[PDB]
Ligand binder design. Structure first.
Ligand code: ANP
Ligand code: ANP
Ligand code: ADP
Lengths: 659, 410
């Protein structure tokens, strides 16, 4: 019913002048490639840009970056009308202007700097009144098309004289900034972002629905993670994204107010968020305001939490507010905010994976002229355990470096601090090398969630167990119905005991690869020691970030390290682990100091043990002449590389009771 | 609302509680319900305040001030005996405990049913199923589920169909159905993580899941199957029934599946307090947590208690379980089972007034029949499982394997 209309979705191609559809739709709409389309959005707007194809598009959702989307006064979810519009004629005169707030500080001629680079061989269809963004000179510039000759919309051709006077246009009310915290600004946090998104989607963008309805719509949204994971952003952006009024509550701020005035604030906090509703009240650094754990010692520290819990209930479904809190971990927060009616929806944000950090890194360089030798992916690679902040700060450092070298030293000619300068000012792969080898690479590490990369290629011999695990996992994850035709239910865990350097680990990380499910490597030394004292509570937390990161396979290497608390605790959270969910559990030199209970059912009821020393030499020199296991292959790669520096091709020089 | 009553200026707090009763004593009969009390009156070791102390008082000053003629029944909701101040327990204040607990198999169903008495559930919505896989949830958990699952429907079908237009009206929601795929989504979320604890269920397993050793089988039925159905037949001899029994021996022997069974023949609940568990996964220094167990024990009667893996641990925990063992009103349905190391076992536990009954655990030929019942026609289970597998893995590759799988103390 009404084919020409489709639901706006985020864009894959960040290029302003393009909207991409799915092929079947485009044929249904007699649309080709270079095809120029017309777009009628909300508030009576029209945005004529170019349409393309896209395999991951929806047969009814038109992908489109925020520019083309704000130029329609549309949010993500609203549906627009597309219509082929090939009757556009090469402009003649394109009189434009910069929104006075993206230019405050840049001197010189904009045109030459941002305009020309922008249009040169693009022919970007443009329509009178469109606000488009240009990233150059190490920042962002918003330009408003004031008057276009082939009116309304024309195609900026090479012969279309593009005028630019000198009276930056004041930013009109409704024309929200494009420099605004957006979805496109958050990277690496895909799957979980996607979760915040649906929770609010309904109550936040479809208000009335919760009037003609009587259903419990989340109110409190808690975000977990370590400082710099990007909660604020993910927050300010989901609000800035769905047209909600965003009202912030900086936790340290709310404490730095006279003993009492504190309250009044939180109250106005909600008293103002309940005004412009839909609205998201974001409590930043909550663990500072409401940490009623064993740090709760105060005649006023207690009144505050109350006052907030008195409001974290006071809000009715009709209020149209979704309160979002950002704490660090289950224990930083008061166990009373967990009540069902307050902050009941946890969303774990975590450390960005290999790909993440890249996106992230990419996201913060969308302005600086990176060099041809800047392999951002590289930067992403050697940075193993960083968070957003760490990664962003890096781009600033690395960047400032450029500016600290080339430019001001060249002060000698003079101080032309202008556009053309920053514009051509490049940041080479040596600027990141400097930024990285600093006093900032020291990132606050913790337990990471990655997607196993190693397959069965890095494990030779013992192919006995290999064809076994694939049956307790490679079948209940891809073949769900084949496991309801027998009656029996899958195992919750398994155990791998034996001598060191045997293969257990490289196997546990492997088994997950064949299921594309994450992994969690909780080393033995580690829970007890390097984490937090008396942390039988830290253990339940592990499972939280475990069952949540599903599909996944858990693995506690070196279980012999430790019926005591820790063990018994890992055992308790082992039974309460919703079996009917993707939460596998591996185990790990001393089958004696091992509590038999761990051997017992409902836990590690599976018992395994670890030709071999002939093929484990092939998968140990693959990426490495043609004539403990690795303790030798390494003493060779060395005497082999030390023999060259002194022709890349050594060895002679290197040379059951329990079962 | 307890947090509410604390979030008021140091002092105004009182005035409230007073009007609280000053208004409830007006429209009386009336029930003054103190929500989240453990926040107001937790005079346990968290009682550190020149004002935290005045409040509790002020309330205890009223929790007495009320006369029979007042016509008010004050109801408090706390989490456990220790969350509350031991002074509210005085006879005259809050003296009547009513333990609400985690909903059993049937419960969760009703519950689930109760929150869908409005949404057009689909013909393929087996609510009982939802009830089944959700083992340890509470009301909230279960309700929140219906909302999630529900919103799901509304988040799919409807607004996507925004394309026609936004007719948010009755006929829409009316025909808007919530399928068994909406609950599948709601369940496989970040909410199924329910706050588990010790549950009270009605043993389902009978004597069918235990073959061999029918010696003890015809024994327990005499210390329970007779004093629960035949009360007078136990006052015609003089002797009084045993308060407990003990089952020691090698692993995977049958003790547990027996303790849960013995209760089934009496339709009496059961409580499985695993060994690792009291000490570890509960709360530290919890010789007080142990008396609590008996509280939720004698209360859930008729019932049979069972501490599996007693060898895990005269120390506190044990001695404590022993103390609350004598003070356990014998003239009430409070049986007590026990549970690989008859050495690290304090003889006192062997002694009378406790586990004066001592038992030990054909067999490995019939324990194979009750292990393949609901499962060809040509440690005990450590094999029957390696078979059901190589049997189902042999099909995915026709539902019918084995060859492939293959006293000092007494
Ligand atoms: N099957 C294998 N294939 C390739 N390399 C292996 C294999 N087994 C052991 N290694 C090498 O031996 C070292 C120990 O590897 P790993 O398998 O990760 O530990 P582990 O045997 O599981 N540890 P542990 O639990 O203490 O016995 C590594 O540096 C590997 O390169
Ligand atoms: N009599 C029995 N009938 C059927 N199955 C049994 C029997 N005894 C043991 N099993 C199996 O053995 C495993 C251990 O069962 P269970 O009887 O519950 O423990 P237990 O012997 O009481 N434990 P423990 O106190 O450590 O010796 C289970 O998976 C059962 O299926
Ligand atoms: N996942 C990410 N992708 C891109 N940028 C990120 C991400 N996480 C953090 N950042 C950047 O790091 C900084 C940290 O932001 P913020 O959300 O406020 O931190 P916090 O998690 O402490 O609240 C921001 O300026 C943001 O742009």
């Amino acid at each position: 019913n009404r084919p020409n209309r489709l639901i706006v979705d985020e864009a894959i191609n960040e290029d302003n002048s393009v909207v991409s559809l799915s092929q079947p739709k485009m044929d249904e709409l007699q649309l080709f490639r270079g095809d120029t389309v017309l777009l009628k959005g909300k508030k009576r707007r029209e945005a004529v840009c170019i349409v393309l194809s896209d395999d991951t598009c929806s047969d009814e959702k038109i992908r489109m970056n925020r520019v083309v989307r704000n130029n329609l006064r549309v949010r993500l979810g609203d549906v627009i009308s597309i219509q082929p519009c090939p009757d556009v004629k090469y402009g003649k005169r394109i009189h434009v202007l910069p929104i006075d707030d993206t230019v405050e500080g840049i001197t010189g001629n904009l045109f030459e700097v941002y305009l020309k680079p922008y249009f040169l061989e693009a022919y970007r269809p443009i329509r009178k009144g469109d606000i488009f963004l240009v990233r150059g000179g190490m920042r962002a510039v918003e330009f408003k098309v004031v008057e276009t000759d082939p009116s309304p919309y024309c195609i900026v051709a090479p012969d279309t004289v593009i005028h630019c006077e000198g009276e930056p246009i004041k930013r009109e009310d409704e024309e929200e900034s494009l420099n605004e915290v957006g979805y496109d600004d958050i990277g690496g946090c895909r799957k979980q972002l996607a979760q915040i998104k649906e929770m609010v989607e309904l109550p936040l963008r479809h208000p009335a629905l919760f009037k003609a309805i009587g259903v419990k719509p989340p109110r409190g949204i808690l975000l977990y993670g370590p400082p710099g994971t990007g909660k604020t952003l993910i927050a300010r952006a989901v609000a800035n994204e769905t047209g909600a009024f965003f009202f912030l509550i900086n936790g340290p701020e709310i404490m730095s107010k006279l003993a009492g005035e504190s309250e009044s604030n939180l109250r106005k906090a909600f008293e103002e968020a309940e005004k412009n509703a839909p609205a998201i009240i974001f409590i930043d650094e909550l663990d500072a305001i409401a940490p009623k754990r064993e740090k709760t010692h105060g005649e006023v520290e207690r009144r505050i939490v109350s006052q907030l819990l008195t409001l974290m209930d006071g809000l009715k479904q009709r209020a149209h507010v979704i309160v979002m809190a950002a704490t660090n971990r289950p224990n930083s927060i008061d166990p009373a905010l967990r009540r069902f009616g307050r902050f009941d929806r946890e969303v774990d944000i975590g450390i960005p994976d290999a790909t993440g950090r890249l996106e992230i890194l990419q996201i913060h360089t969308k302005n600086m002229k990176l060099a041809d030798d800047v392999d951002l992916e590289q930067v992403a690679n050697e940075t193993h355990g960083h968070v957003g902040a760490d990664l962003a700060a890096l781009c600033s450092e690395a960047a400032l470096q450029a500016i600290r070298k080339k430019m001001d030293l060249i002060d000698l000619e003079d101080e032309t601090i202008d556009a053309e300068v920053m514009n051509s000012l490049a940041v080479t792969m040596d600027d990141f090398r400097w930024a990285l080898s600093q006093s900032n690479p020291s990132a606050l590490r913790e337990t990471v969630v990655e997607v196993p990369q190693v397959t069965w290629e890095d494990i030779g011999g013992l192919e006995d167990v290999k064809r076994e695990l694939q049956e307790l996992v490679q079948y209940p994850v891809e073949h769900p119905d084949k496991f309801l035709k027998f009656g029996m239910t899958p195992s919750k865990g398994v155990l791998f005991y034996g001598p060191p350097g045997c293969g257990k680990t490289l196997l546990a990380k492997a088994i997950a690869n064949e299921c594309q499910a994450n992994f969690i490597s909780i080393k033995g030394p580690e829970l007890l020691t390097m984490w937090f004292g008396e942390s039988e509570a830290n253990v339940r937390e592990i499972f939280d970030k475990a069952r949540q990161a599903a599909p996944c396979v858990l693995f506690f290497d070196e279980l012999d390290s430790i019926a005591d608390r820790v063990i018994n605790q890992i055992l308790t959270e082992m039974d309460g682990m919703s079996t009917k969910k993707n939460v596998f559990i591996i185990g790990a030199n001393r089958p004696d100091i091992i509590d038999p209970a761990i051997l017992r059912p409902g836990r590690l009821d599976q018992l395994i043990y670890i030709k071999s020393r002939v093929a484990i030499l092939k998968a140990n020199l693959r990426k490495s002449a043609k004539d403990d296991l690795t303790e030798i292959c390494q003493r060779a790669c060395k005497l082999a590389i030390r023999e060259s520096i002194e022709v890349p091709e050594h060895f002679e020089e290197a040379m059951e009771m329990f079962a």
